[PDB]
């Protein structure tokens, strides 16, 4: 008979864990240890100390993460994005646009 007791102590006996393959150099949705986001994951030389899990830029925005399944310190670029603007001559003269 297998018994299970749950108290106020933190649970240290779990089972298998949530994860996927890790894709570099493409725009991707991601989660690292509960840090969710989306962007282009990339390699880095950023020297995280052994206890450090995440990295931040001057304006507090995340710029790097530890892969919990390897030694990899990734750098996270945001999604490539920008305003789209339409160049047009006046419609009275032509319908062409760029």
């Amino acid at each position: 008979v297998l018994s299970f007791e749950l108290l106020h102590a933190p649970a240290t006996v779990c089972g298998p864990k949530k994860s996927t393959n890790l894709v570099k150099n493409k725009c991707v949705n991601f989660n690292f240890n509960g840090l969710t986001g989306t962007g282009v994951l990339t390699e880095s030389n950023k020297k995280f100390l052994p206890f450090q899990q995440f990295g931040r830029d001057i304006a507090d925005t995340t710029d790097a993460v530890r892969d919990p399944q390897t030694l990899e310190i990734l750098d996270i670029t945001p999604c490539s994005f920008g305003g789209v603007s339409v160049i047009t001559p006046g419609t009275n003269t032509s319908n062409q646009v760029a």
């Binding site: 830029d57 001057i58 304006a59 925005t61 945001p78 994005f81």
Partner: peptide, 22 residues
């Protein structure tokens, strides 16, 4: 202008040097 150089003057270069997320 200095033609050998962004073809700025000498004094324009000092001004462009002293003056110093997504």
């Amino acid at each position: 202008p200095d033609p050998s150089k962004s073809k700025r003057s000498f004094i324009e270069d000092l001004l462009f040097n002293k003056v110093t997320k997504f």
